[PDB]
């Protein structure tokens, strides 16, 4: 079958190879992939940024149909639609797994990085770890919920925001788009969206930001303080990569407020220690979520409470998509479409 | 009466002056002071780090005996022993005061900063905010618990350590010594202590530290990772005034560990955002403790679960104490003795 793999000398691009999968084990399933989103993380992995992963099949935003199950599998049956996400397998028995924090398992397998992923016509998954896609959830949208969706949903959980609190999202496009939809439509927060780009802010307004702030035209911090009534927001979710965003996010918190990073800044962030102490603020960050966070994130999509921006492309375009992504030309996700039929 | 106050041009030191206290209001009490500990925060205040507070009486580790009460006071009576802590008065009705988080009150009065403190022979307190010192707790010891002890007790609650977890305390001075005693004797943590001063570490070993690390001799981060079986600690309490302690603290945490900032050196710290994003780590500040945190912290001292290391000094000695503290010379707390 056809797969996108890391090149022998990782150079940022994929090779498109013929690959024959090994036979599945008793606890596994073989999928026929339908979709697989292309992510910034795929670019990093293909570039060698995390080590030389030559020959590894890319993709951790996969959606697929179970074609075969191993003899011990009871969770899935042939014909089920399931997911291939970043969190592909944990060991099941360590402190992180058993405490309910399995993405931190030290023996974690991540799809498209430390184990073959879903950017291929077929993939193997461990059955009990391939989360089912609910009926009601468009499967092209589900591919984006496996990464951007579960990340922003879980980040907003980690923030501790409760109905009626103010939360600000720094960065209106990309992840920010889905962060705004979850914050407003699922958690019942009052939402401020902050961005340098008016177009995207105009879009945020459409998908449920109560207030938008163009950060090129003003200092966001002073306006955020005014909007919330002097104090600041309960929490900030930082979706932007500009270090100034992280600085402004922290500066905007009311006392005991919490900043949750979902992106990492291009240059190192600093905190003023007397402010962290005298205002008791908290900084944390979040990446994807357990299988249960994923199930929940899917269910809100299935109810129509969030709607990711997606478009489809053919597998052969992988390297065009990579260049578009480096050039900054993509709103939301491009999603490789393996389906023949419908 | 004699008081130590912020200088007219704040320079890090005190003037000793004669002050006459105003008459008390109906919800207030007048104290004859017994003791007031010296805290690094007094030095930051006197240096102007938090703005110019020229003329304000310093001190927020005060212990004194109620001499007079206002007409509306029912919580205290003459002869009660009470405390004068950083959290000196909150508004009572804001979302911080009503949710169990009163030290974050934006209208807070802070002893020794925004209101006259306890480093003087007498002090006025707001009676319902002046937490009684339990019998069975030595007043000199109570002075340390009034700031050092309640700050670290509450910081250890904020860290979320549970019995059996590994916790590291950066800085084994006045704050860090008590932090070790609470983490070990009250919370049941396994405790690492990290400092550059070996005598403070030798003391840390005697009062409860399971492992001590001299960080002029070694890389504390690598050592911590070994002690704990490879991953690092569940939490780090930073009681150290050095920027690098804050950064070693973040680095020493296992995934989902939490760093709690207690010391307020006038510094920035570098925040490793990849560490919070990929390893789940949290950084939070903690600010002294509520009136109930202090009552709890005091009860542990009364029961002998913690024992503050203290030495008494004369008020006239306040500027000598400040230089000892800047030189890293103090074990435990120096306590001004008004008795
Ligand atoms: Zn992704
Ligand atoms: Zn595990
Ligand atoms: Zn203090
Ligand atoms: Zn208040």
């Amino acid at each position: 079958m056809k797969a996108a793999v890391v090149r022998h000398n990782p150079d940022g691009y994929a090779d498109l190879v013929e690959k024959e999968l090994r036979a599945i084990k008793p606890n596994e399933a073989l999928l026929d992939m339908e979709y697989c989103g292309v992510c910034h993380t795929d670019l990093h992995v293909a570039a060698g940024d995390f080590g030389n992963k030559a020959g590894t099949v890319l993709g951790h935003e996969g959606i697929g149909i179970v074609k075969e199950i191993g003899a011990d599998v009871s969770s899935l049956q042939v014909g089920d639609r399931v997911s291939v996400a970043w969190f592909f397998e944990g060991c099941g028995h360590c402190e992180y797994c058993v405490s309910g924090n399995e993405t931190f398992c030290r023996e974690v397998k991540n799809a498209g990085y430390s184990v073959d992923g879903g950017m291929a016509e077929e993939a193997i998954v461990v059955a009990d770890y391939a989360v089912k896609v609910p009926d009601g959830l468009d499967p092209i949208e589900a591919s984006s919920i496996t990464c951007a969706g579960v990340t922003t949903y879980k980040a907003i959980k980690v923030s501790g925001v409760k109905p009626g609190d103010w939360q600000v999202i720094f960065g209106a496009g990309g992840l920010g788009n889905l962060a705004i939809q979850y914050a407003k439509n699922v958690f019942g927060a009052k939402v401020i969206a902050v961005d340098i780009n008016q177009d995207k802010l105009n879009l945020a307004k459409k998908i449920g930001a109560d207030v938008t702030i163009n950060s090129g035209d003003v200092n966001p911090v002073d306006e955020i303080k005014k909007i919330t009534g002097g104090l600041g927001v309960q929490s900030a979710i930082v979706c932007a990569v500009a270090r100034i965003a992280f600085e402004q996010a922290v500066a905007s918190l009311k006392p005991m407020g919490k900043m949750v990073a979902v992106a990492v800044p291009n240059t190192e962030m600093t905190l003023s220690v007397p402010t962290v102490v005298f205002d008791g603020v908290e900084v944390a960050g979040s990446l994807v979520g357990t299988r249960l966070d994923l199930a929940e994130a899917f269910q809100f999509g299935a109810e129509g409470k969030v709607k990711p921006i997606v478009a489809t492309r053919k597998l052969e375009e992988i390297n065009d998509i990579i260049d578009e992504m480096k050039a900054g030309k993509i709103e939301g996700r491009m999603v490789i479409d393996f389906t023949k039929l419908e």
Side-chain angles (χ1 to χ4, degrees), chain A residues 90-94 97 105:
Chain A
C91 79
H93 54 93
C94 68
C97 293
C105 178

Side-chain angles (χ1 to χ4, degrees), chain A residues 156-174:
Chain A
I156 290 167
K157 291 211 261 198
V158 162
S159 71
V161 81
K162 71 180 195 302
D165 284 338
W166 284 100
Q167 177 165 267
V168 60
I169 310 300
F170 271 81

Side-chain angles (χ1 to χ4, degrees), chain A residues 240-244 246 261 263-269:
Chain A
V241 295
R243 174 195 190 277
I244 192 168
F246 294 83
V264 290
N266 293 328
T267 53
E268 249 162 0
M269 184 204 163

Side-chain angles (χ1 to χ4, degrees), chain A residues 257-313:
Chain A
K258 182 156 185 199
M259 184 260 274
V260 185
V262 292
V264 290
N266 293 328
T267 53
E268 249 162 0
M269 184 204 163
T270 57
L271 296 178
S272 152
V273 169
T275 299
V276 166
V277 172
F278 281 111
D279 291 0
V281 294
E282 176 141 33
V283 177
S286 194
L287 174 61
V288 299
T290 78
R291 288 173 284 172
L292 183 58
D293 297 328
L294 179 49
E296 289 166 12
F298 275 157
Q299 201 58 51
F300 293 119
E303 288 163 16
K305 275 146 186 220
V306 314
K307 187 204 177 66
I309 299 179
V310 283
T312 66
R313 305 284 287 271

Side-chain angles (χ1 to χ4, degrees), chain A residues 185-216 218-225 227-229:
Chain A
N185 292 348
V186 170
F187 288 93
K190 296 151 161 339
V191 178
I192 308 164
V194 179
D195 206 291
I196 74 182
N197 185 332
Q198 201 55 49
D199 294 346
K200 296 183 225 209
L201 284 178
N202 271 12
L203 177 47
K205 189 57 221 254
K206 276 200 193 216
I207 48 131
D210 304 277
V211 180
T212 57
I213 298 178
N214 192 350
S215 41
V218 302
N219 165 249
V221 178
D222 296 307
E223 202 179 313
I224 290 159
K225 300 284 199 214
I227 293 158
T228 55

Side-chain angles (χ1 to χ4, degrees), chain A residues 21 31 43 84 145 148 164 197 205 260 304 326:
Chain A
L21 296 186
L31 311 185
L43 282 58
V84 181
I145 300 199
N197 185 332
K205 189 57 221 254
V260 185
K326 288 195 276 200

